[PDB]
Amino acid sequence: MAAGEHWQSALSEHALFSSLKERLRDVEELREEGERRASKDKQLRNLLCVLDGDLLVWDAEECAFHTVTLRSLSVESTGSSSSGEQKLLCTNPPLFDVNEVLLSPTQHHVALVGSKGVMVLEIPKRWGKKSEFEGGEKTVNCRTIPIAERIFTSSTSLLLKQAIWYPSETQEPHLILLTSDNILRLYNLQDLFTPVKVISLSSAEEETTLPHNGRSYKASLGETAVACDFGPLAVLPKGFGQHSKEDTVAYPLYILYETGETYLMYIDLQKSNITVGKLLGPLPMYPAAEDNYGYDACALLCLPCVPNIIVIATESGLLYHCVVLEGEEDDEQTSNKSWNSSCDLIPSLYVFECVELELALKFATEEEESLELDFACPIKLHRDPICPSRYHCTHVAGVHSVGLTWFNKLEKFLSSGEEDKDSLQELAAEQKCLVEHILCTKPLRCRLPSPIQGFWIISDLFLGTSMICITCDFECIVRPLLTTIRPPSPPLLCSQSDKSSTEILPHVLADVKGPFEEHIRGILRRNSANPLLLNSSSKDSSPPPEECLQLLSRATQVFREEYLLKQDLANEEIQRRVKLLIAQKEKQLEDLRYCREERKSLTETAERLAEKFEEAKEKQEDLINRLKRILRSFHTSESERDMKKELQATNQQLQQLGNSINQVNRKMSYQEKQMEKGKS
Template sequence: MAASDPKSWRSELNNHPLFLHLRQGEDDSKSNRAEARSLVVVQDGDIFVWNGRGSNLGTANLKTLLQDEDEVGKRPLKFQTLLCTDPPLSEVNHVTFNPTGNHIALWGGGGVSVMEVPRRWGKHAEFEGGKDKVNCRSYPVAERLFATQSSLQLLQVDWHPGSPSDTHLVILTSDNVLRIYDIEKPDSPYQSFQLGEFADSFSLHSSSSATFNQALGETAVSFTFAPPVDVPVHDKLKWKGDQAKKTETMYPVFVLRGNEDVYYLLTSLEQKSPKVCLQGPLTMHPPADDNYGIDACSILCLPCNPPLVVIATTTGRLYHCIVLQGEEEDDDDRRSEVSWAGSDVSTRSALDMPEPSLYVYESVELELSLGGTPDDIDSYPDYQPDNCPIRLHPDPSSDGRYHCSHAMGVHSVALPWISKLHRFSQSDEEDKDSLLELSRDQPCIVEHLVCTRPVPSSPPAPILGVTVVGDQLLGPTLLCLTSDITCIALPLLTHYADPPPPTLSSLPPQPVTSPLRKLHSKPFDQHIRDILRRDASNPILKSIPKGAQPSDQECFQLLTRATQVFRDEYIKKQYLAREEVEKRVDLLKEQKAQQQSDLDTLREDRKSLTEMAEKLAEKYEEANEKQQEYLKRVENVLKSLQARLPVLSDAEVNMKKELDSLQEKLKHLKNSTQQVKTKWDYQKRQVTQQARQTSSPALSQSQTKHMKELLKQEGDKIGELVKQVNSMRLQCGV
């Protein structure tokens, strides 16, 4: 039951339908894994959990747990499943969102894939309007690289913070190369940086050299981004002395090797082949005989001023190092170690900048297990507290806090002296109060939040995911997913919370370009061939000479070797191929069912839209008829209102004047017509009398012609007068 109390939703989270569904399909055969993973992440109040069995991503809105009982009845708790159109072929151990939250990186030791987050709409802003299953476009990145180098391992993946479109992915591989890929073109790297000489010796013919370098810790194991810096750039002009100076924003990367050497690399995405340098190893103060250990596993840079670098070792020790710029004279003998690569378009004065140094402020040793003795290591081979890789997680709610996850639990580390360090860096040089406050010893605060293996006899239970809820409505909360799919929600202290971030209106606008869609995937049959590819085979035995029989022991050895080869290279791989085929069939069936469901939904929507269109057409016709009727009624009303006005309008006054003038003209025409009729009657009587008096009129030919012309003219005038009279009658309506 959900409740509105922010504290109660944490206790109800583990009973959410999402985790109930994941626990029902959990496979116990993979519970013996010893390394920690990151399969859970929270983005904008939504929780995402990777389901390795179904190769999909389950998501739910955490804010629904704050509903009251009445609201739960109207909107029950539910979850959505994001299906991959091209599921990752390798195992997924980590889930990482890009800064804008529209792409997800799914990666593990065998490769990385990117999933596009679907759009939201509807009343509750759910994916695809709230459908239970949503198909999401997914595609692999650097597929050719991992397909051609089967022994290559992916160590870390992160999104580049300087990407203008948030589509650049940074990957670190075991060949000591840091590559930046644009997911719009996932086949070829956008940039590559060689982090050492390991790539030259990393080949099929020198595998022992690679193992030797890894054993000495001379390969990179982790990296982290630091806050951006402005680096001067000199454009090359025609004259060497004439150079235009400008600055370019670059994003530093701290690269950690296994021997705890830290390197410094400046990256920029403005040019495809930039001219950058790899500086290091950075000097650590105070110096130590063992270089602070040779078993580093993870590095994290906290975005404070000055930057703070955290280095973790497999023995459970943490080093908090403050990054400060070194003196220029101390770097003269180190610039020869810097390697350059790239184009000659511009020359960055990165070498002119002093190399940064690491000042170890304090070291902390984590308590990985609650009990155990050195003799327990021999009794329990899987219990190795001295070889426990630690993964560092930043806390989005506070820059002065981070979290550690490992195979034996979760720790939280708070740094209360970071705020004092920030005030000291912002104060004047003569401010002695801030210096005195910083000099006071205030060590970090370490909290052992979750312990999954308290005693050596406990079975391995690595952490499957750690994430932080930074939503203000839910409250700062640490979510931990254990190996038995139990979600533990722990509230975080707000003593070290950061001030609210600046509003979007105060930030400079950044253009965001839409990534181009490109569908590219590895054929499934090729994936099956790769699984069935044999690394060893049984050779053809040479015929044994007559009279010579091998001993029983030799026959047994040959039989054992052949049986082992058949078991490892045939039967096991066929089982793996069968599992992949069954998994693929299940995924395709699920996708087919989902697509069929989508088609049925679309057909119903089309049918309903057609019916709605017909109803709307009928309503439109009725509305149009009503509109015409109302228009006529309005015209009649306006006419009646205009007719009842006591004062004539200008048009009516002008019309009255015209009618009066026409009335006068009609009277004049009527008089003229009457006169013409009178004259006609008079002439008719005269002609009759003359005809009576003179039986045969004597008119000359010229007189007759003249008379006809006069009569014709009079007749024409009379016809015109009649036409004018008729037109006047029509105009006056008589």
């Protein structure tokens, strides 16, 4: 347990981040006052990744990755604060601002993604004693490959909205580009100029028989695809392919529009079937909402759950948790008129839960009317690699974690046959997700946020589980994460899992629904926490008084209710349990003394009874011996002598027969034991 915390502290204080902070200041000092103001709208970015326990941080000024070996920071090496930094230089640097870094599923390529282009860096080979890049060279030249460069250079109005890797670990890495013209373009790293597949997201129901130059009227009407993500490899629904007896598998690609409209597409790169790559939807959402779930949708994440759970995020901070439901075959009694004889079973989205993020810290002001400046900002969603029902949200003002506490109950309910009404009632019992505001970079209204520039979750057996965040001021923040949405309670010292005590718990305690521990966990359940507050290092004024007092009051109230009061209650319960265990121990020690005294008394009474029995037996033997003497003195036919010989002969025969019977019985019990050993 203690060896796990050293590398996080050493990383947060690493010389790399001090060097990046110095360069940022030198560049900000060279910028004119007008450019300094535009540069303060620091956008949300993701400029870091982790590869095999090395942290790669993109430097936009050097057009390079800085590499930090995280496993070397765990070793208390008394010698030089620079042992393990390497620089990966682009042979051809990006001609666009990099906003995102994407590691390939094969872990051999890194996509450098910007709104005006994509470039793929080939990861250099690892060799030598430390498994360092190119054998431990301080500066490594990495081959870089521009993707679709001519399209972004020729179409100045075109924007890349998102790039994603095709989720195959076994195939060549394919990059999917979502662009502002509502077109998905699939590129292979072998053909960089020609997309392998081009898919228009415009509904092709305007069959007007003219081949050329259909601008997406939808993209011109304001309906833009904003995000897409892959679900796990699934079997295609029956109907997606006339007459193959083979279960075809494809990746479901979910595609989000700014309007909240979600579409589905099945993608397989090995099979060019007409059904594989058809756009399905919009997927009907349930229940119906009056606002249709908003018009400010900014991100989509598929969780690797069965059934698939889609997370839709809005700029306002709303998170919709959508369960993907399979389409039903209409049971044959509502045949009123669709003349499209292709029943594509369109799946539905069931909005199970909606959650508002606290994007900025809410202060109680006594003025309920001072303009909620709806602090809207784009959210980026990050899958948790350790907990499939957990994900993380990064935005300009902070980081949140969201854990779906109903997930295991939904899984239990869907695994229960159609007759388990109790599992549905257990799922329908109101259970909110767990939201934790982990990091706040805008703790005060007078402060500008410090936007997240990089976010990652380490899942490594040696480093443990930890979140890494890098801010726009190069502040590295490392936080250990739990492997579960809820920590398992430390086992009570009294939870001996003795699977051998069918001790009849007295029926009077069976009416307490659940172990007393679940009730105490229910009391100690938190709904909010105080985030880590980043003090953005804008030297030039102390913050301001009413709003500051309201913020302090809120923070103090959360500490009183969620920490102090719950700790005091837990301490009282522990002390009550300790007092009961002491009193029970004292009673058991007294019973053990009583049982020892009773055993001693019983032993002494048994000894005295045995003595009296032997005395009574000796007196009886003496009386018998006296009777035998009297009988002999009183005693002092030929037929009786012969009968006595015959009776003595029969008694000897009976003793021989008794010995023969005992010998037969011993042989039978030996044969029975041999037959039992011959049937194992």
